[PDB]
Design a protein around this ligand. Structure first.
Ligand SMILES: Nc1ncnc2c1ncn2[C@H]1C[C@H](O)[C@@H](COP(=O)(O)OP(=O)(O)OP(=O)(O)O)O1
Ligand SMILES: [Mg+2]
Ligand SMILES: [Mg+2]
Lengths: 412, 545
DNA sequence: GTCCCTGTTCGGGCGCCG
RNA sequence: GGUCGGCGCCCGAACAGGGAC
């Protein structure tokens, strides 16, 4: 009975043609069981090699889950469906969510399997289950219903979701609810008890309205801010002042009012790195003015809703990770630092994966967008291991950098 | 006859037309063979005589099957391939014997005339048109279209493989614990039934394949080991590679060398310690596949070594999922690594090598990390899991590397194996300046136009040097300045520079470079007791920068 | 505009399997 | 002399990004 929303990719673009990567045995077993059940329910069905399109598939467990969960990497399809889900059927992002004291994340992806997918669009949602030791050719399916992981599905389900939440919203009109991909972000200023209670209620409401759910409680207020800090010393060596001046000189690209003239004077000769040199009165003055500038916010820095977000991460060592989110160079919308995450002091990849999820989750709440990451890692290293640590049902875009720290800018 | 399996709707790229190419003129023997063939298939259902209302044509030929008398009729469908829709391949890789589990009974079937048993899309048949001369000059010749997958047409492999899956599925579903390794038309079928029940199950499956137009000739390896399979020999408790025959040459063409390197590569899956760096090194500045190239002394040595490796005999074993995988890596030198994957000691599942070189500058730690990555992925494909590693690097070495590196890096569960040469870092940069050690402010720059430059330093003690350089670059002069301070300092030294470039190369503690200069720097760094490097910005009058 | 790092992405050659 | 699909290894050339004069 249900009418399918026609969908067309952006003009001048083909469907995705991405190769499936190797899967561990436990991930293939889980996927085989899942797809079998899904075909039995009509949610997906077998297709052949004459459909030329493909999207990688794998599987994850969410934080503390024990329950395997199918994940399709629709990044290519998403950035080819872009004016469909961002423009024609965009979901509005509430500025208030980020201001809420507590924000809980609920998984509602399952819902979307209620709704048929436009027949003409199904071919674009094709994936291939692989097999241990290539015992078999891959087994290809495509979607008949709205797939988890495609930005189109929350778009199309939007109607049903608003219709479903209408009552609860009416009762609790102080509560912000935001739908992003397979997630629902539920924020309020209640004290915790009544917050979690209300989440439970909503879980019930959703339960009766024909939609299930597989803690996940954010506090945007306590999302730390990591600024630039200068050292404080009673005695300064030639080396300290060289460090101080390179740092200030890096800083100046972000804060224009910063100056190093008086400080540079102190480094005029070619003295021994280890030599102590008294700060000149002028230099002290310059330095104090600089601490003052770094205390203040950057000037004229505003979010542009038309531009993408970029996140850079620096590995600081000792389990410490710093990051910045910007749309334009040196115009940081946000800075921060994580410490003591899962994998601290033993596994850089697991830590970085965690960082990437935390940062993405923060961006979803603050701007309704997921940033493109600049990752401090060789590609092969990342690609080999990141799916072992992934605990989220979306995947951000990313690229690779190798930027030796010559100046210690975001950590002291 | 021909399979009743439903046909695969195939199309052509929009705005494109069928092929129009005239026959390769061919040998009379070929012509005879093809005439036989086309008559046969005409009788069977596979080929059809076309009228004059077929505008298209594409050349054919034939090859011999290996160790055989039968001909394989092929069609040079290149042009038609250009103009056919793209497919998504379902063949994702190649089965490997080290991935097989132990089965009580085993059979290996092969499908008779595989492709020609699968119906082509009726509507697409028109484009598969080919002509055959009765005699090379004497008669026009009868011409036809295919009713079944051609051999040479880019859609045939995936369509066959998918159709084979489709056919196998009801039987497999009925028989959960029958393992079937399906690669193109080879069916390795394995079970844990006693030979009788197994033979029954085999017969069932051959009947089933028959009901779908597929014949299993009596080139079926009855449960009589060894089974010849995917290039290997499968014995009940071990497998080996089929005989590998190295090229032997007085004078070596680049074609010969490519062939030799390919053959050694195949060999390295189960023969331990094969290297190819020196032989591969001769294929850098090569143009012609005919161009002859002299064997270097070193390449000569490498070949001798491999040749005697290939003498002492080897076999791999099969996989027992109730035991851990272990991967052991040894360093060979010149960025070459080998490895063996086993479960019990001395009993390799398989072996392999890693020699790839990435980036201008590198070190052994990075390369070991890459060899780990490669082995991990291979293991996931073959067994679906990551093996425990035994590696020739001290736990302390690795800790120092990964904790101080600015890039994220990791190795999964591993233990130190004391098998020399051990991987080590060859030098270490101080984190703090060194008291009592001479400080060098160094500096280099060149002329973009005239390519002339200068490299030198000035010292907190008055030591000074400037050196003129001919045919150089900014980057070069920058490594040169550092290098001169290393050359002219005592065992401990602080060095100040504005080259981010040079600093970024050196702080990655390389032990290996494409660049001689960088290698000379490395030699100098290794001889020092204590080196502290620091960066300062230019154009601000810091010392003599 | 050169020089010189990350990454794509297409082409070639050999080997091995069908 | 000549066809296809896969996987391995190697060579190459473009293109994108990013730094430094
Ligand atoms: N050199 C090739 N070019 C194109 N296709 C090939 C080639 N070699 C093999 N194939 C394809 C076509 C075959 O139908 C299919 C099966 O391989 P194969 O067993 O070697 O031949 P075959 O099944 O057609 O006859 P046979 O009964 O002798 O095995 O693989
Ligand atoms: Mg056959
Ligand atoms: Mg065969």
């Amino acid at each position: 009975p249900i009418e399918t929303v026609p969908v067309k990719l952006k003009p001048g673009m083909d469907g995705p043609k991405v190769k499936q990567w190797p899967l561990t045995e436990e991930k293939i077993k889980a996927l085989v069981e899942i797809c079998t059940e899904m075909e039995k329910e009509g949610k997906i069905s077998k297709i052949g090699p004459e459909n030329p399109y493909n999207t990688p598939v794998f599987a994850i467990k969410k934080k503390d889950s024990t329950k395997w969960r199918k994940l399709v990497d629709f990044r290519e399809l998403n950035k080819r469906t872009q004016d469909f889900w961002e423009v024609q059927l965009g979901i509005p992002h509430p500025a208030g969510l980020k201001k809420k004291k507590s924000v809980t994340v609920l998984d509602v992806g399952d819902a979307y399997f209620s709704v048929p997918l436009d027949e003409d669009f199904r071919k674009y949602t094709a994936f291939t289950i692989p097999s241990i030791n290539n015992e078999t050719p891959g087994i290809r399916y495509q979607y008949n219903v709205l797939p988890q992981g495609w930005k189109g599905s929350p778009a199309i389900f939007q109607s049903s979701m608003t219709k479903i939440l209408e009552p609860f919203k009416k009762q609790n009109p102080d509560i912000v609810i935001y739908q992003y991909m397979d997630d629902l972000y539920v924020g309020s200023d209640l004290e915790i008890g009544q917050h979690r209670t209300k989440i439970e209620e909503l879980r019930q409401h959703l339960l009766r309205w024909g939609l299930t759910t597989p803690g996940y409680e954010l506090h945007p207020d306590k999302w730390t801010v990591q600024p630039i800090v200068l050292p404080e010393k009673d005695s300064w060596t030639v080396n300290d002042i060289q460090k101080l001046v390179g740092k200030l000189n890096w800083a100046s690209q972000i804060y224009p009012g910063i100056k190093v003239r008086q400080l540079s004077k102190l480094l005029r000769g070619t003295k021994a790195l280890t030599e102590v040199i008294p700060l000149t009165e002028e230099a002290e003055l310059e330095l104090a003015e600089n601490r003052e500038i770094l205390k203040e916010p950057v000037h004229g820095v505003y979010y542009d809703p038309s531009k993408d977000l970029i996140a850079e991460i620096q590995k600081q060592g000792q389990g410490q990770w710093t990051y910045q989110i910007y749309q334009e160079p040196f115009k940081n919308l946000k800075t921060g630092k994580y410490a003591r995450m899962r994998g601290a002091h033993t596994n850089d990849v697991k830590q970085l994966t965690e960082a990437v999820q935390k940062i993405t989750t923060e961006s979803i709440v603050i701007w309704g967008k997921t940033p493109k990451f600049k990752l401090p890692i060789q590609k092969e290293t990342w690609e080999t291991w990141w799916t072992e640590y992934w605990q989220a049902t979306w995947i951000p875009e990313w690229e690779f950098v190798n930027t030796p720290p010559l100046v210690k800018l975001w950590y002291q | 006859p021909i399979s009743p399996i439903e046909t695969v709707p195939v199309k052509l790229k929009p705005g494109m037309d069928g092929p129009k190419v005239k026959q390769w003129p061919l040998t009379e023997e070929k012509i005879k063979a093809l005439v036989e063939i086309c008559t046969e298939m005409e009788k069977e259902g596979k080929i059809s005589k076309i009228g004059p209302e077929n505008p298209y044509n594409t050349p054919v030929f034939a090859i011999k099957k290996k160790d055989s008398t039968k001909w394989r009729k092929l069609v040079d469908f290149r042009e038609l391939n250009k103009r056919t829709q793209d497919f998504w391949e379902v063949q994702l890789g190649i089965p490997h014997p080290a991935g097989l589990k132990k089965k009580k009974s085993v059979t290996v079937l092969d499908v008779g005339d595989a492709y020609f048993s699968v119906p082509l899309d009726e509507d697409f048949r028109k484009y598969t048109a080919f002509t055959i001369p009765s005699i090379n000059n004497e008669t026009p010749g009868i011409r036809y279209q295919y009713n079944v997958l051609p051999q040479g047409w880019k859609g045939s492999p995936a369509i066959f493989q998918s159709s084979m899956t489709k056919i196998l599925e009801p039987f497999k579903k009925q028989n959960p614990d029958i393992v079937i390794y399906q690669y193109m038309d080879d069916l390795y079928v394995g079970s844990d039934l006693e030979i009788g029940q197994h033979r029954t199950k085999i017969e069932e499956l051959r009947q089933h394949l028959l009901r779908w137009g597929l014949t299993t000739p009596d080139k079926k390896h009855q449960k009589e080991p060894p089974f010849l399979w995917m290039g290997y020999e499968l014995h009940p408790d071990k497998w080996t590679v089929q005989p590998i025959v190295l090229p032997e040459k007085d004078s070596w063409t680049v074609n010969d060398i490519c062939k030799l390197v390919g053959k050694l590569n195949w060999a390295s899956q189960i023969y331990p310690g094969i290297k190819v760096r020196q032989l591969s090194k001769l294929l850098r500045g090569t143009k012609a596949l005919t161009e002859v190239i002299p064997l270097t002394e070193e390449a000569e040595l490498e070949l001798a070594e491999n040749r005697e490796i290939l003498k002492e005999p080897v076999h791999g074993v099969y996989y027992d999922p109730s035991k851990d995988l272990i991967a052991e890596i040894q360093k060979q030198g010149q960025g070459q690594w080998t490895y063996q994957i086993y479960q019990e000691p001395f009993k390799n599942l398989k072996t392999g090598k890693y020699a790839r070189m990435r980036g201008a500058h590198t070190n052994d730690v990075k390369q070991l990390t890459e060899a780990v990555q490669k082995i991990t992925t291979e293991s996931i494909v073959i067994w679906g899991k990551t093996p425990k590693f035994k590696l020739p690097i001290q736990k302390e070495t690795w800790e120092t590397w990964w904790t101080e590196y600015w890039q994220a890096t990791w190795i999964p569960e591993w233990e130190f194996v004391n098998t020399p040469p051990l991987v080590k870092l060859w030098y270490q940069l101080e984190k703090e300046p060194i008291v009592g050690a001479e400080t060098f402010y160094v500096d280099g720059a060149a002329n973009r136009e005239t390519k002339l430059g200068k490299a030198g330093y000035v010292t907190n003690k008055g030591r000074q040097k400037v050196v003129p350089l001919t045919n150089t670059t900014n980057q070069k002069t920058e490594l040169q300045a550092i290098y001169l301070a290393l050359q002219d300092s005592g065992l401990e030294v602080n060095i100040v520079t504005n080259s981010q470039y040079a600093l970024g190369i050196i702080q990655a503690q390389p032990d290996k470079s494409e660049s001689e200069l960088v290698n000379q720097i490395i030699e100098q760094l290794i001889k020092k007791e204590k080196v502290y490097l620091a960066w300062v910005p230019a154009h601000k009058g810091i010392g003599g920068n």
